[PDB]
Design an enzyme around this catalytic site. Structure first.
Site, PDB file in Angstrom:
ATOM      1  N   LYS B 112       9.855 -10.660  -7.323  1.00  0.00           N
ATOM      2  CA  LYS B 112      10.233 -10.345  -8.574  1.00  0.00           C
ATOM      3  C   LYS B 112      11.662 -11.152  -9.388  1.00  0.00           C
ATOM      4  N   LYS B 190      -1.225  -5.967  -6.641  1.00  0.00           N
ATOM      5  CA  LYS B 190      -0.778  -4.396  -7.054  1.00  0.00           C
ATOM      6  C   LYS B 190      -0.612  -4.325  -7.694  1.00  0.00           C
ATOM      7  CE  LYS B 190       3.256  -4.333  -4.754  1.00  0.00           C
ATOM      8  NZ  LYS B 190       3.480  -2.581  -4.812  1.00  0.00           N
ATOM      9  N   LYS B 193       4.880   0.104 -10.316  1.00  0.00           N
ATOM     10  CA  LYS B 193       5.479   1.283 -10.952  1.00  0.00           C
ATOM     11  C   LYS B 193       6.070   0.961 -12.779  1.00  0.00           C
ATOM     12  CE  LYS B 193       8.910   1.959  -7.836  1.00  0.00           C
ATOM     13  NZ  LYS B 193      10.675   1.223  -8.326  1.00  0.00           N
TER      14      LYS B 193
HETATM   15  N1  LIG Z   1       0.142  -0.389  -5.134  1.00  0.00           N
HETATM   16  C1  LIG Z   1       0.879   0.084  -4.097  1.00  0.00           C
HETATM   17  N2  LIG Z   1      -0.462   0.904  -3.643  1.00  0.00           N
HETATM   18  C2  LIG Z   1       0.539   1.292  -2.096  1.00  0.00           C
HETATM   19  N3  LIG Z   1       1.607   1.799  -1.921  1.00  0.00           N
HETATM   20  C3  LIG Z   1       2.721   1.644  -2.337  1.00  0.00           C
HETATM   21  C4  LIG Z   1       2.317   0.623  -4.490  1.00  0.00           C
HETATM   22  N4  LIG Z   1       3.510   0.707  -4.238  1.00  0.00           N
HETATM   23  C5  LIG Z   1       4.067   0.932  -3.990  1.00  0.00           C
HETATM   24  N5  LIG Z   1       4.569   1.153  -2.786  1.00  0.00           N
HETATM   25  C6  LIG Z   1       5.186   1.754  -1.144  1.00  0.00           C
HETATM   26  O1  LIG Z   1       5.594   3.110  -1.826  1.00  0.00           O
HETATM   27  C7  LIG Z   1       7.147   2.958  -1.220  1.00  0.00           C
HETATM   28  C8  LIG Z   1       7.770   3.045  -2.335  1.00  0.00           C
HETATM   29  O2  LIG Z   1       8.039   2.146  -3.320  1.00  0.00           O
HETATM   30  P1  LIG Z   1       9.048   1.685  -4.175  1.00  0.00           P
HETATM   31  O3  LIG Z   1       8.845   0.381  -4.576  1.00  0.00           O
HETATM   32  O4  LIG Z   1       9.433   2.549  -4.800  1.00  0.00           O
HETATM   33  O5  LIG Z   1      10.930   1.481  -2.771  1.00  0.00           O
HETATM   34  C9  LIG Z   1      10.166   0.374  -1.770  1.00  0.00           C
HETATM   35  O6  LIG Z   1      10.139  -0.762  -2.219  1.00  0.00           O
HETATM   36  C10 LIG Z   1      11.157  -0.031  -0.669  1.00  0.00           C
HETATM   37  N6  LIG Z   1      11.611  -1.000  -1.062  1.00  0.00           N
HETATM   38  C11 LIG Z   1      12.089   1.305  -0.933  1.00  0.00           C
HETATM   39  C12 LIG Z   1      13.100   1.731   0.303  1.00  0.00           C
HETATM   40  C13 LIG Z   1      14.274   1.219   0.168  1.00  0.00           C
HETATM   41  N7  LIG Z   1      14.912   1.261   1.686  1.00  0.00           N
HETATM   42  C14 LIG Z   1      13.927   2.157   2.422  1.00  0.00           C
HETATM   43  C15 LIG Z   1      14.498   2.450   3.890  1.00  0.00           C
HETATM   44  C16 LIG Z   1      12.656   2.428   4.028  1.00  0.00           C
HETATM   45  C17 LIG Z   1      11.720   2.423   3.754  1.00  0.00           C
HETATM   46  C18 LIG Z   1      11.540   2.326   2.560  1.00  0.00           C
HETATM   47  C19 LIG Z   1      13.138   2.040   2.157  1.00  0.00           C
HETATM   48  C20 LIG Z   1       7.083   2.037  -0.202  1.00  0.00           C
HETATM   49  O7  LIG Z   1       7.043   2.540   1.191  1.00  0.00           O
HETATM   50  C21 LIG Z   1       6.372   1.720  -1.074  1.00  0.00           C
HETATM   51  O8  LIG Z   1       5.537   0.089   0.123  1.00  0.00           O
END
Ligand SMILES: Nc1ncnc2c1ncn2[C@@H]1O[C@H](COP(=O)(O)OC(=O)[C@@H](N)Cc2c[nH]c3ccccc23)[C@@H](O)[C@H]1O
Ligand SMILES: COc1ccc2nc[nH]c2c1
Lengths: 324, 329
Positions: B112, B190, B193
């Protein structure tokens, strides 16, 4: 009235330098300003604490501030952790604080709290639309960060925060008893250098008697910081307590030795401290009073803090909370 | 009482098929088996700079999308992170039991990293607070959150050792397939989004017709003859497609490998385009029903934040009592 914010550490045992310098000054300006006193227990845990000592120290600090003369009807006094808005704004302000700024604040076994607390400190101040902040030399870099955060946020979203200013005017000179060049600090490693506010007559006498003076012949009680730092410090302390001028005291001690000066200083300081301890012990032993002071203060702070946070949250663009 | 599931997703950018397979798909399937709590993490989103109106809209988009995937408000607790003060409160407290070296060593922080703010650095500590507040047993996430989840386990153990049984030590729940969905034109990277090149991504709210075209143009390999088999080193794109197909349909990789014996990448992509296009069409149908019903979305956030606050305050009260704060009267 301008809003003044002061953080009070629940860990620092206050000295006569803290009282006669900054505190007594601010007790007399409670009708001039809207003063806020925050007992900063969330800042305290950045260093590892014994749980029971921290709880006690929080209440010891509250009682001592009330004993010094902070009036909970005039000023706002509360415990930091009782107002959730501090942590809420703290996190939001993390996102508008550069990493570089925190690394520049004067290795990998340090806890993240000790690295990141200047942002929480900024949130403490900015929550209450603060105008003035009384700081020592050590806290100046933290205030600049708070001012830089406020200006950075306001430039993006409009005039949400007040940009705080330091309280420039100084109070009362109280130096260390064995190093009269160095100021009397509550953080001092050696406690023979300091006179705590809860010390008894016998402990003060012992510390005052051992205070460094000089080898002038004849011994002469005259004010001279360059050449007679120790004797001058004792006169300053005596002046601060009694309200008599230095030249008046020089006339009083004409043809008198340092032993008689030290006796009058010990007598006078203990006279001041004994009244302060009557108040302290009375407030500190009344748990119902301390609870009611903390509730009212947190209630006052939370009402003002929520107004600012709602504007901060609306500006950033969070969905508004649903209530009942 | 049932064991507790907690997970969250940021309302920043536009959620992808990656986000669905690695997380949301597991969230929907876990609702009856465990006590499930799902969170829209708007406080985590602001670590990257957002437009104010876009952030507000993205939060309600994300809520509607949870509902469209099958997250039932009668079964699960659904809430917005900033509506519960206890996340920030515990977040600060856990800063003091997290080492600097643990945060500076983070892969996600380094990737990031113009706007390298303290929130981006301090990201995993608030994430730990999100999980530990609700006495969480299971955390359904993608593979990229494994390192963040390790730290919240370390923090939980570290705190518990000093003060007693305050937190549960949470466990990851990473799926066998679709845990790390890769980019269509860059299968060694990867799927993000917020990719600058939109052709890498399959958005959940993206037009299916446009999604079908992206799958058709997905990079494969130069093998002659073309063979549909899993091999992430030499056949990253084909493997990514097989992995996507496996996760949508529920079929294993060896099952699909046999199914595509003597077939080529035209068959593979036709099946992937068909399966994904059908899933997004149905998903987007439900989405607009939930997204335009503002009163329903308002009630879900209200009830969810209420249920969350009750549980979060129980944990924070014990944490505050343990560390030695004077209790709020
Ligand atoms: N290319 C991909 N392939 C498979 N899985 C993926 C891919 N991109 C994202 N993910 C998964 O999607 C979830 C959301 O990710 P975010 O970036 O919105 O958001 C995140 O990256 C978290 N830090 C948000 C968060 C904040 N507090 C928490 C507490 C527990 C669990 C999660 C969270 C995630 O589970 C992520 O592993
Ligand atoms: C700077 O203050 C804060 C406040 C809440 C937090 N949660 C995680 N880190 C935090 C830092």
């Amino acid at each position: 009235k301008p809003i003044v914010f002061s953080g009070a550490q629940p860990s620092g045992e206050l000295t006569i330098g803290n009282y006669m310098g900054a505190l007594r000054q601010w007790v007399n300006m409670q009708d001039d300003y809207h003063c806020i006193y925050c007992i900063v227990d969330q800042h305290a845990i950045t260093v590892r604490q014994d749980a029971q000592k921290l709880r006690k120290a929080t209440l010891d600090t509250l009682a001592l501030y009330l004993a010094c003369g902070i009036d909970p009807e005039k000023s706002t006094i509360f415990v930091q952790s009782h107002v959730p808005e501090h942590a809420q704004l703290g996190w939001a302000l993390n996102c508008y604080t550069y990493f570089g700024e925190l690394s520049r604040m004067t290795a990998e076994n340090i806890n993240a709290g000790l690295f990141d607390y200047p942002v929480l400190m900024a949130a403490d101040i900015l929550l209450y639309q603060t105008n003035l902040v009384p700081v020592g030399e050590d806290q100046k870099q933290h205030l600049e960060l708070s001012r830089d955060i406020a200006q950075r946020f306001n430039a993006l979203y409009g005039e949400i925060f007040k940009v705080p200013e330091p309280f420039i005017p100084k109070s009362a000179r109280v130096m260390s008893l064995l190093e009269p060049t160095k100021k009397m600090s509550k953080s001092d490693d050696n406690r023979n250098n300091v006179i705590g506010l809860l010390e008894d007559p016998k402990s003060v006498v012992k510390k005052i008697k051992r205070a460094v003076t000089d080898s002038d012949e004849p011994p002469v009680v005259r004010y001279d910081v360059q050449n007679k730092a120790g004797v001058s410090n004792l006169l300053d302390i005596l002046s601060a307590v009694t309200g008599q001028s230095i030249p008046e005291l020089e006339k009083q001690f004409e043809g008198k030795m340092y032993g008689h000066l030290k006796g009058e200083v010990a007598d006078a300081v203990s006279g001041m401290l004994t009244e302060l301890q009557e108040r302290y012990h009375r407030f500190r032993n009344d748990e119902a009073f301390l609870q009611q002071v903390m509730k009212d203060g947190a209630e006052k702070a939370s009402a003002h803090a929520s107004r600012t946070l709602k504007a901060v949250y609306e500006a950033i663009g969070f969905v508004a909370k649903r209530h009942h």
